[PDB]
């Protein structure tokens, strides 16, 4: 009940109640209880996390021997494990604590248990001034978290243009891939950060497939960022067939995620026009192996006239969207079985329980047929409903 008095005076920065308390014991055992956990954290960790500069200066100007011990710390409503003081100060935006922790010899490389450096923490929340300071004090730009997600990737995802710009000026490698194949170009595509994406292309960032087989163009189509799709379908590094599929998949995203059938049809005619623009080389639609009961045995429209009838027929547009997504994403991408389940749920809600059950049977059999190099997260099952690479 004396340690808890020390930690509490720390998490709150009341140095009076601390200095007056800490004058009773001697050096030997003032050190021993500044160095102890209170629900996973140390007094120093909490001093830095809440920006209490003159108390971290005091604690260090005493015994500076827990400066690298990570513990537990609270951010955004959750608590992270193994976080050193420097990491907590950078994440929280306390530049002054950052400068003093370093001035007392803190290691700019010490990470949390996810291997998230102080530099990564300052990029996530947008603390450009702390980013410049950590880099100018020997931070390593290419140390990734354990998913292989870099500081540049997270800055793109979060839309921190100035920070991404700064890292690229300091020589960050624009073509790093995470373990799942994520590049910084995918983080721009999935956040809709068009102007950061252009800036990545000033450095000749290469468009590549990730583990799911998706380029940044297709990822924009999956996530619905029309500004990215519009830019990249007019970019020479995407071929004619990739453009068609990107537009067809985007329209399927308009049907199922945006619930906008007029928008969908506009992208589907754009694609259908490209398919038939050159009569010397028609790009006709692939042919699946069999008709699918869960899809009401439907077929993809293969000409512009079959697209004029689609306007009037909302259920046929819903089956086209399912057919397109299974063709382009395939059965092991999570969005495929997910949107098959969503479509079934809407039919349940409309009284069509046979259609509902047939689609749900089909989604389960699809997830089970593709059992085992990437992860099947139980986060999209029925019970759970009732990215970790991009964590801080």
Element (H or E) spanning 261, and its range? helix 261-275
Residue 382 included in any domain: no
Strands 78-83 and 71-75: antiparallel
Range of the domain at 231: 141-238
Whether residue 183 lies inside any domain: the answer is: yes
The Cα 286–Cα 272 span in angstroms is 13
Count Cβ neighbours within 10 Å for each residue of 102-124 and write b for 16 or more, e otherwise.
Answer: beeebebebbbebebbbbbbbbb
- Note whether 132 and 147 are same-domain residues: no
Q: What is the DSSP letter of 240?
A: H
Q: DSSP letter at 298?
A: -
* Co-location of 36 and 1 in the same domain: yes
CATH label of the domain that carries residue 203: 1.25.40.20
- On whether the CB atoms of residues 82 and 112 are closer than 8 A, the answer is yes
What is the three-class DSSP state of 120?
helix
Q: At what angle do helices 161-169 and 128-135 cross, to 10 degrees?
A: 10
In a domain, 362, yes or no: no
- At residue 344, φ and ψ (nearest 5 deg) are -60, -40
Burial per residue of 24-51, b for 16 or more beta-carbon CB atoms within 10 angstroms, e otherwise: eeeeeebeebbeeebeebbbbbbbbbbb
CB–CB of 139/117 below 8 Å? yes
225 in a structural domain: yes
Per DSSP, the residues of 133-170 read HHHTTT--TT---TT---HHHHHHHTT-HHHHHHHHHT
* Strand, coil or helix: 7: helix
> If phi over 0 gives left and psi between -120 and 50 gives alpha, with beta otherwise, what is residue 259?
left
Tokens, residue 44: 């120093």
DSSP annotation string for 175-196: T---TT---HHHHHHHHT-HHH
Q: For the residues of 45-111, what is the DSSP string, one character each? A: HHHHHTT-HHHHHHHHHH---STT--EEEEETTEEEEEE-HHHHHHHHT-HHHHHHHHHTT--TT--
188 vs 195: CA distance, rounded Å: 9
Give helix 128-135 / helix 95-103 axis angle, nearest 10°: 20
Technique used by the depositors = X-ray
**Is 327 a domain residue?**
no
Residues 145 and 30 in one domain: no
Rounded CA separation 11/9 (Å): 6
Q: How far apart are CA 294 and CA 354, in angstroms?
A: 9
Of 140, 162, 179, which marks where a domain is finished?
140
The angle formed by the CA atoms of residues 6, 10 and 12, to the nearest 5 degrees, is 125
- Structurally, the chain folds into a number of domains equal to 2
Do 213 and 128 fall within a single domain?
A: no
Q: Is residue 93 part of a domain?
A: yes
Phi, psi angle pair for 325, to nearest 5°: -70, -40
The alpha carbon of residue 270 and the mean position of all alpha carbons in its chain are separated, in whole angstroms, by 30
Q: Is residue 274 part of a domain?
A: no
DSSP 380: G
- Distance from C-alpha of 367 to C-alpha of 251, rounded to nearest angstrom: 24
Same structural domain, 85 and 182: no
By three-state DSSP, how is residue 268 classified? helix
CB 331 within 8 A of CB 370: yes
Among 182, 213, 238, the domain boundary falls at: 238
**82 and 159 in one domain?**
no
Does 73 lie in the same domain as 7?
yes
Under 8 Å CB-to-CB from 380, ≥6 apart: which residues?
334, 337, 338
Tell me 25's DSSP state: S
Q: Are residues 134 and 12 in the same domain?
A: yes
Regarding whether 146 and 117 lie in a shared domain, the answer is no
Whether residues 161 and 228 share a domain: the answer is yes
Measured CA to CA, the distance from residue 274 to residue 239 in angstroms comes to: 12
**Does residue 216 lie in a domain region?**
yes
Do residue 128 and residue 175 come from a single domain?
no
- Matching residue, tokens 């801080």: 392
**SS3 of 38, please?**
strand
Max CA pair span of the chain? 92
DSSP secondary-structure letter at 221? H
Picking from 211, 238, 265, the residue at the C-terminal end of a domain is 238
- Say if residues 387 and 377 touch (Cβ distance below 8 Å): no
């Amino acid at each position: 009940d004396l340690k808890t008095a020390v930690f509490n005076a720390a998490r709150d920065g009341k140095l009076r109640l601390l200095t007056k308390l800490l004058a009773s014991k001697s050096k030997e055992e003032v050190s021993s209880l500044i160095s102890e956990k209170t629900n996973g954290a140390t007094p120093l960790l909490m001093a830095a996390r809440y920006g209490h500069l003159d108390m971290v200066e005091f604690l260090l100007e005493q015994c500076s021997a827990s400066i690298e011990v990570g513990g537990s710390v609270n951010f955004d409503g959750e608590t992270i494990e193994g976080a050193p003081p420097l990491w907590a100060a950078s994440a929280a935006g306390h530049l002054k604590v950052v400068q003093s922790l370093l001035n007392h010899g803190a290691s700019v490389n010490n990470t949390t248990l996810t291997n998230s450096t102080p530099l990564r923490a300052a990029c996530f929340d947008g603390h450009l001034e702390i980013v410049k300071y950590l880099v100018e004090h020997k931070a390593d730009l290419e140390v990734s978290n354990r998913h292989g997600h870099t500081c540049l990737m997270i800055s793109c995802y979060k839309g921190h243009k100035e920070i991404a710009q700064y890292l690229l000026e300091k020589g960050a490698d624009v073509n790093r891939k995470s373990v799942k194949g994520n590049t910084a170009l995918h983080d721009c595509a999935e956040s809709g950060s068009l102007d950061i994406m252009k800036m990545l292309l000033m450095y000749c960032a290469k468009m590549e497939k990730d583990g799911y087989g998706m380029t940044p163009l297709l990822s924009a189509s999956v996530t619905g960022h029309t500004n990215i799709v519009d830019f990249l379908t007019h970019h020479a590094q995407t071929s004619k067939t990739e453009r068609i599929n990107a537009l067809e998949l985007l329209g399927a995203t308009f049907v199922d995620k945006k619930r906008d059938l007029l928008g969908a049809l506009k992208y589907w005619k754009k694609a259908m026009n490209m398919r038939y623009s050159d009569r010397t080389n028609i790009i006709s639609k692939p042919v699946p192996q069999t008709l699918i009961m869960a899809y009401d045995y439907a077929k993809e429209v293969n000409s512009a006239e079959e697209l004029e009838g689609l306007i009037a027929d909302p259920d046929e547009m819903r089956m086209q969207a399912l057919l397109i997504r299974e063709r382009i994403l395939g059965p092991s991408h999570p969005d495929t079985s997910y949107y098959i389940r969503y479509r079934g749920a809407v039919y349940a809600d409309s009284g069509n329980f046979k259609r509902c059950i047939n689609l749900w049977k089909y989604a389960l059999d699809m997830q089970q047929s593709n059992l085992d190099p990437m992860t099947a997260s139980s986060l999209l099952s029925f019970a759970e409903l009732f990215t970790q690479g991009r964590a801080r």
